[PDB]
Motif scaffolding. Structure first.
Motif, short mmCIF file in Angstrom:
data_model
loop_
_atom_site.label_atom_id
_atom_site.label_comp_id
_atom_site.label_asym_id
_atom_site.label_seq_id
_atom_site.Cartn_x
_atom_site.Cartn_y
_atom_site.Cartn_z
N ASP A 299 -51.22 4.23 -21.99
CA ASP A 299 -50.16 5.01 -21.35
C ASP A 299 -50.42 6.48 -21.59
N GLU B 283 -48.86 8.87 -20.39
CA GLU B 283 -47.61 9.62 -20.40
C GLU B 283 -47.03 9.55 -21.81
N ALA B 284 -47.67 8.75 -22.65
CA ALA B 284 -47.24 8.58 -24.03
C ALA B 284 -48.41 8.89 -24.96
N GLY B 285 -49.37 9.64 -24.44
CA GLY B 285 -50.53 10.00 -25.23
C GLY B 285 -51.36 11.05 -24.52
N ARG B 286 -52.58 11.28 -25.00
CA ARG B 286 -53.47 12.25 -24.37
C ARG B 286 -54.87 12.10 -24.94
N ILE C 13 -48.41 9.86 -33.54
CA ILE C 13 -47.42 10.83 -33.98
C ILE C 13 -46.08 10.11 -34.10
N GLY D 156 -44.03 6.78 -28.19
CA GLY D 156 -44.22 7.60 -27.01
C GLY D 156 -45.22 8.72 -27.23
N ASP D 157 -45.85 8.76 -28.40
CA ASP D 157 -46.82 9.82 -28.68
C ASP D 157 -47.98 9.36 -29.56
N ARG E 260 -52.07 9.71 -29.73
CA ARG E 260 -53.19 10.47 -29.18
C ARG E 260 -54.59 10.03 -29.60
#
Lengths: 509, 509
Positions: free
Chosen positions: B234, B236-239, B251, B254-255, B257
């Motif tokens: 996802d 939109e919940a990472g990068r 993190i 929803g986060d 990375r």
């Protein structure tokens, strides 16, 4: 325990709190730049946990125990020494924090956060009706905070509060009082009116159309990075990233970051947004690193901070000299500037026009926006105006001061988030920044000679070094008013600013 | 105070600590990705400041008081309940935190920070003489930590420690012991030895040269991003961000990375590096969000974590079906592949060859690298090997297990940062990962039918949903060994992995 021991424990404890707050600063930076779309709820929770910790630390009774052990001792006899400056500032912050009852602090923080949240979506809906309750709650609690702080003595050395509003002002601009502000704005307001007469009645009109042509964003970023290193912003200790609303945040020594908003069809946003933030950044990067985490090494006030941002954004950034240096480069970078002369460009980026939105307002009308907010705030805290009547007062004030009035809430009383955030007694610092920026500049040119010709040659370091030794290096050693007087030799005034506007615009219009 | 109230205070207090610790995770992510060059010294001090704070929270005597109230109460009668799981794990962490002296933890953290710093500079240099002192300090402090934890009873339900080393293994793989590791490695060593022989005497040879042609890094990024969303990551919940050494960090909900490192002249690193970290991230994104900041919602072990990363990197990422699905896309993105067939490319990214660098090692030889490290670590802690004699033992170990040995330190004992960072008893988890991955994948295909055809179609969600339901959702409800057995029905074994390899490479070679 000995005073030196007490001072060290206090030093360690206070820096520990600063290190902890800086982790929050990094999170705040990340939230506006890299955070994933679905990571916001968790981020808010992280910040809230941190906020509770920091609040606990700032009111820890030990701070008072250690302070009392150091105060009055030979360690702080000289009020200008690092030790006395830190102890003096620590005592004041400690007293301000403990003066506010637990529930009050908790309620206010929650109200602000909720008002801000609702405001984010209410403004675009032009929903003042739904927003009002949140605003009144924040306001009511802020008034209460002010009444508590107003009944207590000011900071040692500062003048007495003239009214409850000064208790709020004092928090953002240490020592500032409404009775000192009002006459500055009176001078400023009259000068701006006289100047706007000449400009509005002028036959000359800038071609702003040039600023709305195509300006590839990747190019704007490259140009911005070049101006950044050219002016003296250390990219080894900072970075530039895109964001919804430009801001500057100092994580710590060697880490001060800035951001800007680029628009493909509006040159100004990305570029001047960058220079603006850079100004804040240069100040932070100029603070004495050995004193990070202590008052001696902290920026002194929002006004002084804004004087550094406006200095580089406008006094330097929109000057003829600055563009004689960079306009040809911009001509090489941006195709839309092919048939544009230096004169036209410099005139366009300095276009004046009464408008509705403060953040987008030009140099000349900008402070009229602040005056509106200031008068409304005074009336509120003086019990002359009700939150329910803000919209009407706002529209009438704008019509009276700017000659233009809102046609809705969205672009009227609801344009800024400040009040939702509980930022009352804050707006005036923007104006102080512009006035101080000009005063400092006047003094700088008197000692270094005209700066324009140097800027035209890309020689910004002499001026920067000057601001470092006279302002940045001093941290919070002196109250902002005292700092201005020690550097310029005169108490704050609106004249140097007006003199600056008059010369520049007399030549433009 | 009822047991409920105790558990409630414990949960709230422990999650608060979790939130505060997650600010550190954000700082660690930033430190390896966005931090400016001069901000490292401040970041290290921020980390140490946070550590001081967290230590206080983790050893707060209230934790013991609350835990005593909840243990033996009705809240934990059911061993599989959220409450019991959390209480059990909190007591273990609490006892650990209290056992380790604050001074040792600090010194150790500083010894590692310094050892790592000097390392990343002494490795490009063949400077082992300069690094050794730093390593010995970290080692000495790590052995002390091991001795403290080793003198204490293991977590209830876990087998006893068989030697000093187990105290370290336990920290990364709850419940794991050298006792159960060796037989797994002997098995593995026997199986790998024979396959490598067949491969060498094989007349089939992969065209690895293809992977070393040019591969524009920007095209690699866009391709990587395609694989991520296609596999269920996802965004939109990472990068995804570039870094010197790819890693993944959660993190919060929803986060999550990830990062990779691209080489303009080498396909593998950037692409398979991305898939590898993705497997880690898929696990984190699959943990029960409602239980975040709670043992019940935490990843169970590095072995299980690594089983997820290797699952997506290799089991899926290097499979025939995966490439039947994405090679055409790759063919379109990279000109270098214009004249390449799926069979040749697939064979290429699966090329086997004993080499010196672990992180570059192929599926078959990889674990032999881990075997070497384990034997060395056991020798060190058993007091049979001195850190000064690591280079020699390293060489001998490599020649015997892999058939090739380093000629210097750079590509020898100094290739991994692990020992400088004090990561001892860590390496074995990489092998558990590869083994668990094979076992998990087996059960998956049994219940879902052949996966090759689905992968060929880009149908990965079914397999991912399976891992979510059977592995990720469980958090740390079960000990890792138990988790594997409950899901696969088998105890950890090297046979499923060897079976997997023998089938796969008998086909390729």
């Amino acid at each position: 325990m000995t005073p030196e021991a007490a001072y060290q424990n206090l030093l360690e404890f206070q820096r520990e709190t600063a290190y902890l707050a800086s982790l929050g600063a990094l999170a705040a930076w990340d939230q506006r730049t890299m955070i994933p779309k679905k990571g916001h709820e968790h981020r808010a929770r992280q910040m809230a946990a941190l906020a509770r910790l920091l609040h606990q630390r700032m009111t820890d009774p030990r701070i008072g125990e250690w302070l009392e052990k150091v105060e009055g001792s030979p360690l702080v006899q000289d009020p200008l020494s690092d030790a006395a400056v830190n102890v003096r500032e620590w005592r004041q912050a400690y007293e301000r924090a403990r003066a506010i009852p637990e529930r009050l602090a908790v309620e206010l923080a929650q109200a602000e956060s909720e008002a801000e949240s609702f405001w984010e979506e209410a403004r675009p809906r032009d929903d003042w009706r739904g927003f009002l309750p949140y605003l009144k709650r924040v306001y009511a609690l802020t008034k209460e905070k002010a009444e508590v702080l107003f009944a207590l003595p000011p900071a040692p050395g500062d003048p007495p509060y003239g009214e409850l509003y000064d208790a709020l002002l004092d928090g953002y601009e240490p020592g500032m009082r409404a009775r000192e502000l009002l006459p500055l704005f009176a001078e400023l307001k009259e000068g701006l009116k006289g100047l706007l007469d000449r400009i509005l009645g002028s036959g000359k009109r800038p071609d702003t159309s040039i600023l709305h042509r195509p300006y590839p964003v990747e190019a704007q970023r490259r140009f911005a990075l070049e101006l950044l290193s050219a002016c003296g912003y250390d990219l080894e200790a900072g970075r530039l990233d895109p964001t919804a609303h430009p801001f500057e945040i100092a994580i710590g020594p060697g880490d001060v970051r800035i951001t800007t908003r680029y628009y493909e069809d509006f040159f100004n946003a990305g570029i001047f947004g960058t220079l603006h933030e850079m100004g804040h950044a240069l100040y932070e990067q100029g603070l004495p690193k050995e004193h990070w985490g202590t008052p001696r090494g902290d920026a002194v006030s929002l006004g002084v901070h804004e004087s550094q941002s406006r200095t580089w954004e406008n006094l330097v950034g929109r000057s003829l000299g600055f563009w004689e240096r960079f306009f040809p480069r911009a001509r090489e970078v941006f195709a839309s500037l092919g048939d544009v002369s230096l004169e036209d460009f410099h005139f366009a980026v300095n276009a004046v026009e009464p408008s509705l939105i403060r953040v987008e307002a030009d140099e000349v009308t900008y402070n009229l926006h602040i005056l509106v907010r200031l008068e409304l705030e005074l009336a509120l805290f003086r019990g002359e105006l009700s939150p329910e009547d803000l919209p009407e007062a706002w529209a009438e004030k704008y019509r009276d001061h700017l000659g233009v009035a809102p046609k809705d809430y969205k672009d009227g009383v609801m344009q800024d988030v400040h009040w939702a955030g509980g930022l009352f007694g804050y707006f005036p610092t923007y104006t102080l920044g512009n006035l101080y920026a000009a005063q400092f500049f006047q003094k700088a040119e008197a000692e270094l000679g005209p700066l324009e010709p140097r800027f035209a040659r890309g020689e910004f370091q002499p001026f920067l070094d000057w601001t470092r030794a006279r302002i940045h290096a001093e941290g919070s050693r002196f109250r902002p008013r005292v700092l201005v007087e020690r550097v310029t030799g005169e108490a704050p005034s609106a004249r140097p600013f007006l003199a600056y506007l008059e010369k520049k615009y007399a030549a433009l219009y």
